[PDB]
Design an enzyme around this catalytic site. Structure first.
Site, PDB file in Angstrom:
ATOM      1  N   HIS A  57     -31.913  -2.325  -4.273  1.00  0.00           N
ATOM      2  CA  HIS A  57     -32.037  -3.059  -2.988  1.00  0.00           C
ATOM      3  C   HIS A  57     -31.300  -2.513  -1.764  1.00  0.00           C
ATOM      4  O   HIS A  57     -31.435  -3.085  -0.669  1.00  0.00           O
ATOM      5  CB  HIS A  57     -31.656  -4.531  -3.182  1.00  0.00           C
ATOM      6  N   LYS A  83     -42.926  -2.073 -11.011  1.00  0.00           N
ATOM      7  CA  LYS A  83     -42.381  -3.329 -10.467  1.00  0.00           C
ATOM      8  C   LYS A  83     -43.324  -3.848  -9.373  1.00  0.00           C
ATOM      9  O   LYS A  83     -43.814  -3.082  -8.531  1.00  0.00           O
ATOM     10  CB  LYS A  83     -40.958  -3.150  -9.945  1.00  0.00           C
ATOM     11  N   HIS A 114     -28.507 -10.300  -7.433  1.00  0.00           N
ATOM     12  CA  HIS A 114     -29.970 -10.306  -7.276  1.00  0.00           C
ATOM     13  C   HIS A 114     -30.369 -10.531  -5.822  1.00  0.00           C
ATOM     14  O   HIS A 114     -29.667 -11.167  -5.050  1.00  0.00           O
ATOM     15  CB  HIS A 114     -30.629 -11.417  -8.099  1.00  0.00           C
TER      16      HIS A 114
END
Length: 119
Positions: free
Chosen positions: A11, A41, A114
């Site tokens: 990320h 993904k 996350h």
């Protein structure tokens, strides 16, 4: 790999990696960052701010958002990649968009683990 390291790998892209267009950005980055093996993904957001900038969301740089989720005070440059069609089999082809948005992440123990969504 620590959960923190996995969060950066998946990320964090800062400074933003140069590419000819967003589709190509997504195709390259999803692969480079380990997100196209063994399966494609489906979606992933890259945040173009430093690890330190994102980590403060877990503390003074963000606000509680329920459970372990926190919303950032700052808006961030983002690139969002979404898989073309529905199959997990490679080849993995992506489309992408860019934006500037606050983000909602999950934290544990003061560190990001996350990415949830853009606000």
């Amino acid at each position: 790999e620590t959960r923190y390291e996995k969060f950066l790998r998946q990320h964090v892209d800062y400074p933003r990696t140069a590419a000819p267009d967003t589709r190509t950005y997504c195709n390259q980055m999803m692969q480079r960052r380990g997100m196209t093996l063994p399966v494609c993904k489906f979606t992933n957001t890259f945040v173009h701010a430093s690890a330190a900038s994102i980590t403060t969301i877990c503390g003074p740089g963000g606000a509680p958002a329920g459970g372990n989720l926190r919303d950032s005070t700052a808006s961030f440059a983002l690139t969002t990649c979404r898989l073309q069609g529905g199959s997990q089999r490679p080849p993995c082809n992506y489309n992408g968009g860019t934006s500037t948005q606050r983000i909602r992440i999950a934290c544990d123990g003061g560190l990001p683990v996350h990415y949830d969504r853009a606000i």
